[PDB]
Amino acid sequence: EYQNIFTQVQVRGPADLGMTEDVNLANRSGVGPFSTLLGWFGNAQLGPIYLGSLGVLSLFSGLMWFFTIGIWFWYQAGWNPAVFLRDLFFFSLEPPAPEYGLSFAAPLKEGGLWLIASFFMFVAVWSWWGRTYLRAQALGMGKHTAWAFLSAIWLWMVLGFIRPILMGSWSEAVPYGIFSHLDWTNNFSLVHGNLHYNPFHGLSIAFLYGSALLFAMHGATILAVSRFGGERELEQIADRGTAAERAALFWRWTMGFNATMEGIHRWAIWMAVLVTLTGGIGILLSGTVVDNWYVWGQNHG
Amino acid sequence: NFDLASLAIYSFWIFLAGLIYYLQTENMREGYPLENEDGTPAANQGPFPLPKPKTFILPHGRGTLTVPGPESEDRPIALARTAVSEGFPHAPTGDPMKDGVGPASWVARRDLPELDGHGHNKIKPMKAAAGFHVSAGKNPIGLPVRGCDLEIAGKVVDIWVDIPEQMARFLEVELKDGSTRLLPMQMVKVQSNRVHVNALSSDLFAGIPTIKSPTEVTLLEEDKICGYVAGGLMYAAPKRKS
Amino acid sequence: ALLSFERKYRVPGGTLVGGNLFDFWVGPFYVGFFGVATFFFAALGIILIAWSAVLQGTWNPQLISVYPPALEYGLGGAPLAKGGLWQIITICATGAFVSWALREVEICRKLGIGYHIPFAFAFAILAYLTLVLFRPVMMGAWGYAFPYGIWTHLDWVSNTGYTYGNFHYNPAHMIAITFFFTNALALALHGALVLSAANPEKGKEMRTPDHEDTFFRDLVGYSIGTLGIHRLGLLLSLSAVFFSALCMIITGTIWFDQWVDWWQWWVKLPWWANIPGGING
Numbered sequence: 163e164y165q166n167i168f169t170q171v172q173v174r175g176p177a178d179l180g181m182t183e184d185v186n187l188a189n190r191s192g193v194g195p196f197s198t199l200l201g202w203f204g205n206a207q208l209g210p211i212y213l214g215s216l217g218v219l220s221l222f223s224g225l226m227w228f229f230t231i232g233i234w235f236w237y238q239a240g241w242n243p244a245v246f247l248r249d250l251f252f253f254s255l256e257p258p259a260p261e262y263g264l265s266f267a268a269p270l271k272e273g274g275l276w277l278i279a280s281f282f283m284f285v286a287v288w289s290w291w292g293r294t295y296l297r298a299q300a301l302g303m304g305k306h307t308a309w310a311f312l313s314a315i316w317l318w319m320v321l322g323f324i325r326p327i328l329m330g331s332w333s334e335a336v337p338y339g340i341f342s343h344l345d346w347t348n349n350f351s352l353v354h355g356n357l358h359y360n361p362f363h364g365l366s367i368a369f370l371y372g373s374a375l376l377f378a379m380h381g382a383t384i385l386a387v388s389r390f391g392g393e394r395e396l397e398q399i400a401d402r403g404t405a406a407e408r409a410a411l412f413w414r415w416t417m418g419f420n421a422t423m424e425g426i427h428r429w430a431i432w433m434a435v436l437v438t439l440t441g442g443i444g445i446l447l448s449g450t451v452v453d454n455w456y457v458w459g460q461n462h463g
Numbered sequence: 464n465f466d467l468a469s470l471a472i473y474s475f476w477i478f479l480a481g482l483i484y485y486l487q488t489e490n491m492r493e494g495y496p497l498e499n500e501d502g503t504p505a506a507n508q509g510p511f512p513l514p515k516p517k518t519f520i521l522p523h524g525r526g527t528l529t530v531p532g533p534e535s536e537d538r539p540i541a542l543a544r545t546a547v548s549e550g551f552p553h554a555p556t557g558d559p560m561k562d563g564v565g566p567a568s569w570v571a572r573r574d575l576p577e578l579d580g581h582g583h584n585k586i587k588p589m590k591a592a593a594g595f596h597v598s599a600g601k602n603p604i605g606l607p608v609r610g611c612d613l614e615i616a617g618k619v620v621d622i623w624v625d626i627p628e629q630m631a632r633f634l635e636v637e638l639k640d641g642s643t644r645l646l647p648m649q650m651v652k653v654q655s656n657r658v659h660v661n662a663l664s665s666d667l668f669a670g671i672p673t674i675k676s677p678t679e680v681t682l683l684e685e686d687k688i689c690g691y692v693a694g695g696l697m698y699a700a701p702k703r704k705s
Numbered sequence: 706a707l708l709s710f711e712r713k714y715r716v717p718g719g720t721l722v723g724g725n726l727f728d729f730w731v732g733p734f735y736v737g738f739f740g741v742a743t744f745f746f747a748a749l750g751i752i753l754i755a756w757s758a759v760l761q762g763t764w765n766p767q768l769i770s771v772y773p774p775a776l777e778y779g780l781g782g783a784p785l786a787k788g789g790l791w792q793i794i795t796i797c798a799t800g801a802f803v804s805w806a807l808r809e810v811e812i813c814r815k816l817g818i819g820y821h822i823p824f825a826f827a828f829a830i831l832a833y834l835t836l837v838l839f840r841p842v843m844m845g846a847w848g849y850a851f852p853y854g855i856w857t858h859l860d861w862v863s864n865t866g867y868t869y870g871n872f873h874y875n876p877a878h879m880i881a882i883t884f885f886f887t888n889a890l891a892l893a894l895h896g897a898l899v900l901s902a903a904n905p906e907k908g909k910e911m912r913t914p915d916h917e918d919t920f921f922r923d924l925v926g927y928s929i930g931t932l933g934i935h936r937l938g939l940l941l942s943l944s945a946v947f948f949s950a951l952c953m954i955i956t957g958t959i960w961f962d963q964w965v966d967w968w969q970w971w972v973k974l975p976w977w978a979n980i981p982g983g984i985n986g
C-alpha cells in the first residue's frame with residue numbers, strides 16, 4: 163500500500179502570492195525559487211516573505227547578538243581560525259561575576275559584553291513577538307500564535323532576566339555557549355537539590371513527552387485519513403466529513419473517548435504551551451523560594 | 464508546611480482540572496448527545512455537559528455553522544441489528560459498497576466544491592489549471608490503471624490538483640466505456656509502467672461514484688468517491704489475488 | 706451509547722484472529738481478540754503489582770517499587786521477591802503493549818484507514834524494550850533495567866546518566882533532545898495556526914487554508930502546507946524516540962567512558978592539538 167509519507171508525483175504551477183487582506187504589500191518580497199527537494203515532503207514554494215519595520219529591527223538586533231558572541235569567540239581563540247574551529251563548542255560568553263550584582267558597570271571582558279549581547283537578544287525576540295501578532299492581525303486571524311509564543315518567551319525571560327533579578331545578580335543567568343550552557347543546566351540541578359524532585363519540572367516533562375505522544379497520534383491519524391482528505395482540517399471543521407468521523411471513531415474505539423477536528427488543536431496548543439509555562443514556574447521558584455527540591459519534596463509527600 | 468511552592472503546585476492542579484473540563488466539553492461539539500443503537504437519546508450522557516453553541520461565519524457567503532446543534536445523518540443507512548443487546552455489529556442488509564456503510568461510508572457533506580481564499584474552486588483538473596505540470600516523479604498520464612485482480616481497468620487521462628497546495632489529489636481514469644472516474648492519490652501506486660490500485664478489482668472501477676461536472680468535484684462527491692474506494696479493502700478482498 | 710454518526714461504521718469484520726467471536730464493543734470500547742489479550746496481560750500484571758506491594762509492606766502508590774534482579778543473577782530467572790515479579794511484569798507489560806497495537810490494527814481495518822497509528826505506537830514499544838530488554842541483554846544482566854516505581858525510576862535515570870558524567874554530552878542524546886524540543890515547537894505552531902484560522906478576529910469570517918500559508922510565508926518565508934505539517938509532526942516525534950533508543954543502546958555496550966570524552970577526539974587531532982592559548986591549547 164501507499165503510505166503518503168513522501169509525495170509520489172510533484173506538480174508545480176505559478177507561484178502563490180498569498181492572501182492580501184490588510185497586509186501592506188510594499189513590504190512583501192518577491193517570490194523565491196521552488197525546491198523540488200522540499201517538494202517531496204511538503205510545499206516546494208519559497209517565499210515571498212514580509213519584511214516591515216519590526217522584521218528589520220528584529221533581524222538587526224538578532225545579527226548584533228550573533229556578532230557580539232562571535233567577536234568574543236574570536237577573541238577567546240586569539241584570532242586564530244584553526245583554534246576557532248577546534249574549540250568552537252567550548253567558547254562561552256559568561257555573565258558578570260556575582261560581585262557586580264545587578265550593576266551595568268561590568269567591564270566588557272568581565273561580563274560587560276554579555277549584557278550588551280543580552281540587550282540585542284531581548285530586542286530581537288520581543289520585536290519578533292510583535293511581528294507574530296501583527297502578521298496575524300493584518301490577515302484578520304486570531305492571535306493564538308503570538309499567545310503560544312509568549313509561553314516560550316516566559317521560560318526564556320525567567321532564565322535570563324526575571325530569576326537573575328530576583329536573585330540579585332546577572333551571574334545567575336545562562337552563558338552563551340554550546341557546551342557551557344549544558345554545563346550550566348547540569349550545575350543548576352545539582353545546586354538546587356535535584357530538579358527531578360521539582361514538581362513543576364515533572365509536569366514540564368509530562369507535557370514534553372505528551373507533546374511527542376500527541377503529535378505522533380495526530381500526525382499518524384491525519385495521514386491515516388488523508389485518503390479521505392482529512393488534512394483539509396478547516397473545511398472538516400466547517401462541514402464534517404468521513405475523515406473526521408473515522409478519525410474520531412478510531413480513538414473512541416481504542417481508548418473510549420475522542421476529539422473533534424477543531425478540538426484536537428486545542429488539546430495540541432495547550433499540551434505544548436504547558437511545557438514552558440510550568441517549566442518557567444519551576445525555574446522561577448528555584449533558589450528564590452525552594453533551595454533543595456529533594457528535601458522540600460520529603461516534607462510534601 | 465504551607466509554603467509558596469506548595470500553594471503554586473496546588474493552584475496549578477486546580478487550574479489543570481478546569482482546563483481538562485473545558486477541553487473535554489469543547490470536544491463534544493460534534494456527535495453528541497450520545498444515542499442508543501435505535502437512535503433515541505441515551506440515558507447516561509457522561510459527567511460532562513454539552514457546550515453552549517458557538518457560531519462560525521463561513522467565507523464566500525456560505526452561511527453560518529452553529530455547533531452543537533440538532534444533527535442528522537441526512538441519508539438512509541442500510542444496516543440491521545444483529546443482537547438484542549447493545550455492543551454487537553450491525554450487519555449490512557444490501558451491497559455495502561453501493562449502500563456506503565462500514566469502511567465504504569460517506570458523509571452527507573455540502574454538495575458544493577471547497578473554495579480557495581479567492582473564492583475559486585480549490586481542486587481542478589490539470590488540463591484546466593494554467594501553468595501546472597508534473598515537476599518530479601513518474602508522470603502517470605497515459606499510463607494503464609490496474610486493479611487487484613491484475614486486470615487493466617483503464618488509463619490515466621488527467622491529474623486533479625489542489626491549486627493553493629500545488630498537490631495532486633485525484634487521478635482521473637478513463638474506463639473501457641469512455642467515461643471517467645476519480646481515484647484518490649493516496650490509494651494508488653504510481654509505477655514505471657502502470658498505476659496499480661490494490662483497493663478495487665478492475666470491474667469495481669465502474670462502481671466508483673461519478674461527478675456531475677467534468678471540471679469540478681463537490682465535497683459530497685469526494686466523500687462518496689473516497690469512501691467507495693477505501694471500502695474496497697474490506698469488501699473486494701475476495702477478488703484480491705494472493 | 707453511540708456518537709450520532711457512529712452506527713453506520715459498526716459493521717462486522719476486520720479481525721485478524723478469531724473471526725466474529727470477539728467482534729463486538731463494550732460501551733465505546735472495541736474488543737476483538739487483542740482486546741481480550743490486552744485485558745488478560747493487564748489484569749495479571751496489575752495483580753502481580755498488588756502482590757509485590759504486599760511483599761513490600763505499603764499500599765501508598767508513591768512507595769511501591771518492583772525492582773529487577775540483582776546484577777549477580779545475570780540474565781537468569783530470579784525468585785519472585787528478588788526480581789522475579791519484575792520479570793513476569795515485564796512479560797505482561799510487553800504482552801499488553803503489543804496486544805494494544807494489534808487491536809489498533811484491527812480497528813484500522815474495520816474503519817478502512819491507514820495503519821500509521823499502530824506503526825507509530827511501535828516506536829514507543831521499541832524504546833521501552835530498548836531499556837528493559839535489548840540493553841540489559843547486551844550488558845549481561847536484567848539488573849541494568851529500570852525499576853517500576855514512580856520515583857525510583859527517576860533515580861535510575863539519574864544514576865544511569867551520571868555513570869557517564871554529564872549525559873548531555875552523548876551526541877545521540879543531543880539529537881534526540883533537539884527533535885523533542887522541535888516537536889513541541891511544531892505542535893504549538895500547528896495548533897495555534899488552525900485555531901487562529903477557525904476562530905479569527907471578532908467581526909470576521911472564518912479564514913481559509915490560504916490564510917494559513919500566507920501567515921507563515923509572511924512570518925518566515927516558507928509554508929510546509931497542511932499535509933506536510935502532519936508528516937513533519939509524525940517524523941519529529943518518531944525521530945526523537947528513535948534517537949532516544951539509539952543513545953541508550955550504545956551506552957554501556959560500545960561506549961563506557963564519560964561522554965565528554967567523545968568530543969575530545971575533535972579536540973586533540975594532531976594538526977591542532979598543540980596550538981596553545983585557547984581552551985584546548
Ligand code: BCL
Pocket residue numbers: 358363364365367368369371372375751754833836851855856858859862
Ligand atoms: C522515558 C525515559 C525514562 C523515564 C523518565 C521520566 C522522567 C525524567 C519523568 C518521568 C515521569 C513520568 N513517567 Mg517515566 N520514564 C521512563 C519510562 C516510563 C514508563 C514506561 C513503561 O516506559 C511509564 C509508564 C512512565 C510513566 C511516567 C509517569 C509516572 C510520569 C509522567 C509521564 C507522562 O505523562 O508521559 C506522557 C504521557 C502522557 C501525558 C499520557 C498519560 C500517561 C499516564 C499518566 C501514565 C501513568 C502510568 C502509571 C503511573 C503506571 C501504570 C498504572 C498501571 C495501572 C499499573 N515512565 C523511562 C525509564 N519519566 C515524570 C514524573 O513526574 O515522574 C514522577 C518525570 O519527571
Ligand code: BCL
Pocket residue numbers: 287314315317318321346347348349350351356357358362363366367370437438440441442444445862886889
Ligand atoms: C542534569 C540536568 C537536569 C535538568 C535540568 C534542567 C534545567 C536547569 C531546566 C530543565 C528544563 C527542562 N527539562 Mg530537565 N533536567 C534533567 C532531566 C530531564 C529529563 C530526563 C530524561 O531526566 C527530561 C525529559 C527533561 C526535560 C526538560 C524539559 C521538559 C524542560 C525544557 C522545556 C523546553 O522546551 O525548553 C526549551 C525551550 C526554551 C528554553 C525556550 C526558548 C524560547 C526563546 C524565545 C527562543 C529564542 C531563540 C533564539 C532567538 C535563537 C533563535 C535562532 C533562530 C532559529 C534563527 N529534563 C536533570 C534533572 N532541565 C527547563 C525547565 O523548565 O525546568 C523546569 C530548565 O530550565
Ligand code: BCL
Pocket residue numbers: 318321336340343344347873878879880882883884886887890
Ligand atoms: C532547557 C534547559 C536548558 C537547555 C538545555 C539543552 C540541552 C540539554 C540540549 C540543548 C540543545 C540546544 N539548545 Mg539549549 N537549553 C536552554 C536554553 C537554550 C536557549 C535559550 C534562548 O534560552 C537557546 C537558544 C538554546 C539553544 C540550543 C541549541 C544549541 C540546541 C538545540 C535546541 C533545539 O532543539 O531548538 C529547537 C529550535 C529549532 C529547531 C529552530 C532552529 C534553532 C537553531 C538550530 C538554534 C540556534 C541557537 C544558536 C544561535 C546556535 C549556534 C550554532 C553554531 C554553534 C554557531 N538553548 C536551557 C538553559 N539545550 C541540545 C543540543 O544539541 O545541545 C548541543 C541539547 O542537547
Ligand code: BCL
Pocket residue numbers: 347348802829830832833835836861862863865866867871872873878881882885945946948949950951952953
Ligand atoms: C540526570 C539525568 C541525565 C540524563 C540521563 C538519561 C538517561 C539515563 C536516559 C535519558 C533519556 C532521555 N533523555 Mg536525558 N538526561 C539528562 C537530561 C535531559 C534533558 C535536559 C533538559 O537536561 C532532556 C530534555 C533530556 C531528554 C531525554 C529524552 C531524549 C529521553 C527520554 C524520552 C524517551 O526515551 O522516551 C521513550 C519513551 C518511552 C520509554 C515510553 C514507553 C511507553 C510504553 C510503550 C507504553 C506505556 C503504557 C503505560 C504503562 C500504560 C498507561 C496506561 C494508561 C495509564 C491508561 N534529558 C541528565 C543529564 N536521559 C532516556 C532514553 O533515551 O531512553 C531511551 C534514558 O533512559
Ligand SMILES: CC[C@H]1c2cc3[nH]c4c(c3C)C(=O)[C@H](C(=O)OC)c4c3nc(cc4[nH]c(cc(n2)[C@@H]1C)c(C(C)=O)c4C)[C@@H](C)[C@@H]3CCC(=O)OC/C=C(\C)CCC[C@H](C)CCC[C@H](C)CCCC(C)C
Pocket residue numbers: 220221224225227228286287288290291294307308310311312313314434435436437438886887889890893894924925
Ligand atoms: C511552546 C513551547 C515551544 C516553543 C514555541 C514557539 N517558539 C516560537 C513560537 C512558538 C509558539 C513562535 O511563534 C516563534 C516563531 O516565529 O516560530 C516560527 C518561535 C520561535 N522559536 C524559536 C526558537 C526556539 N524555540 C524553542 C523552544 C520552544 N518554542 C518550545 C519547545 C527553542 C529551544 C531552545 O528549544 C528554540 C531555539 C525561533 C525559531 C522562533 C523565534 C524567532 C526570534 O525570536 O527571532 C529573533 C532572532 C533573530 C531574527 C536572529 C536570526 C539570525 C541568527 C542570529 C543567525 C544568523 C546566521 C548567519 C548570520 C547567516 C547564515 C546564512 C546561511 C545559512 C545562508
Ligand SMILES: CC[C@H]1c2cc3[nH]c4c(c3C)C(=O)[C@H](C(=O)OC)c4c3nc(cc4[nH]c(cc(n2)[C@@H]1C)c(C(C)=O)c4C)[C@@H](C)[C@@H]3CCC(=O)OC/C=C(\C)CCC[C@H](C)CCC[C@H](C)CCCC(C)C
Pocket residue numbers: 371372374375378379382416417743746747748749750751794797798801802805809822823825826828829852853854855856858942943946
Ligand atoms: C513514539 C512517540 C510517542 C508516543 C506515541 C504513541 N503512544 C501511544 C500511541 C502512540 C502513537 C498509541 O496509539 C497509544 C494510545 O492508545 O494512545 C492513546 C499509546 C500510548 N502511550 C501511552 C503512554 C506513554 N507513551 C509515552 C511516550 C510516547 N508515546 C512517545 C514519546 C510515555 C512516556 C513515558 O513518554 C507514556 C507514559 C499510553 C497512554 C498508550 C498505550 C496504552 C497501552 O498500551 O495500554 C495497554 C496496557 C495497559 C492497559 C496496562 C498495562 C499494565 C502493565 C501490565 C503493568 C504496569 C507496567 C509498567 C511497566 C509499570 C510502569 C511504572 C512507571 C512508574 C515506570
Ligand SMILES: COC1=C(OC)C(=O)C(C/C=C(\C)CC/C=C(\C)CC/C=C(\C)CC/C=C(\C)CC/C=C(\C)CC/C=C(\C)CC/C=C(/C)CC/C=C(/C)CC/C=C(\C)CCC=C(C)C)=C(C)C1=O
Pocket residue numbers: 375376379380381383384406409410411413414416417418419420421422423426429548731734735736740741743744747
Ligand atoms: C484529527 O483526529 C483526531 C481525533 O479525532 C477527531 C482524535 O480524536 C484524536 C485523539 C486525541 C484526543 C482525544 C486528545 C486527548 C488525548 C490525549 C491527551 C492523549 C493522552 C491519552 C490518555 C491519557 C488517555 C489514555 C487512556 C487509555 C489508554 C484508555 C483507558 C484504558 C482502558 C479503559 C483500557 C480498557 C480497554 C481494553 C482493555 C480493550 C478491551 C476492552 C474490554 C472492555 C475488555 C473486556 C473483555 C471481556 C472478556 C468482556 C466480556 C463481555 C462479554 C463476553 C459480553 C457478552 C455479550 C452477550 C450479551 C452474549 C486525534 C489524535 C486526532 O488526530
Ligand SMILES: COC(C)(C)C(=O)C/C=C(\C)CC/C=C(\C)CC/C=C(\C)CCCC/C(C)=C/CC[C@H](C)CC/C=C(\C)CCC=C(C)C
Pocket residue numbers: 228229230231232233235236277280281283284318319320321322323336337338339340343
Ligand atoms: C566568523 O564568525 C562571526 C564573527 C561572523 C560570528 O559571529 C560567528 C558567530 C557564532 C559562532 C555565534 C555562536 C552563538 C552561539 C554559540 C549561541 C549559543 C546560545 C545559546 C545556547 C543560548 C543559551 C541561553 C541564552 C539565554 C537564556 C539568554 C537569556 C537572555 C535574557 C532573557 C535577556 C535579558 C536581558 C538583559 C540581561 C539585558 C537587559 C536590557 C534590557 C533593555 C532589558
Ligand SMILES: CCCCCCCC/C=C/CCCCCCCC(=O)OC[C@@H](O)COP(=O)(O)O
Pocket residue numbers: 303304305306309310312313316431432435439443904905906
Ligand atoms: C505567575 C506565573 C504565571 C505565568 C506568567 C505569564 C506567562 C505567559 C504565558 C501566557 C499564557 C500561555 C498561552 C495561552 C494558551 C495558548 C493560547 C490560547 O489558546 O488562547 C488564546 C486565544 O484566546 C486566542 O486569542 P484571541 O485571538 O486574541 O482571542
Ligand SMILES: CCCCCCCC/C=C\CCCCCCCC(=O)OC[C@@H](O)COP(=O)(O)O
Pocket residue numbers: 304477478479480481482484485900904
Ligand atoms: C468540573 C471541574 C471544575 C474545576 C474547578 C473550576 C475551574 C478551575 C479554574 C480555572 C480553569 C480555567 C480554564 C480556562 C481555559 C481557557 C478558556 C479560554 O481561553 O476561553 C476563551 C477562548 O475560548 C477563546 O479562544 P478562541 O475562541 O479560539 O479565540
Ligand SMILES: CCCCCCCC/C=C\CCCCCCCC(=O)OC[C@H](O)CO
Pocket residue numbers: 191194208209210211891894895896898914917918921925926927928929930931934
Ligand atoms: C525568502 C525565502 C526564505 C526561506 C526561509 C525558510 C525558513 C523555514 C523555517 C521554518 C519552517 C518550518 C515551520 C514548521 C511549523 C509549521 C506550522 C504549521 O501548522 O504550518 C502548516 C502550513 O505551513 C500551513 O497550512
Ligand SMILES: CCCCCCCCCCCC[N+](C)(C)[O-]
Pocket residue numbers: 360361362364365368372432433
Ligand atoms: C492537557 C493534558 C493533561 C495531561 C496531564 C499529565 C499528568 C502527569 C502528572 C505528572 C505528575 C508530576 N508530579 C510531580 C506533580 O507528580
Ligand SMILES: CCCCCCCCCCCC[N+](C)(C)[O-]
Pocket residue numbers: 418419420483487508509510733
Ligand atoms: C490526562 C489526560 C486525560 C484526560 C481525560 C479526559 C476524560 C474524558 C472522558 C469523557 C468520556 C466521554 N464519553 C465516553 C462519556 O463520551
Ligand SMILES: CCCCCCCCCCCCCCC
Pocket residue numbers: 417418419497507508509706732733
Ligand atoms: C487519565 C485516564 C483517562 C481514562 C479515560 C477512560 C475512558 C473514558 C470513559 C468512557 C466511559 C463511557 C461511559 C459513557 C458513555
Ligand SMILES: [Fe+3]
Pocket residue numbers: 380384395427895899935
Ligand atoms: Fe492538524
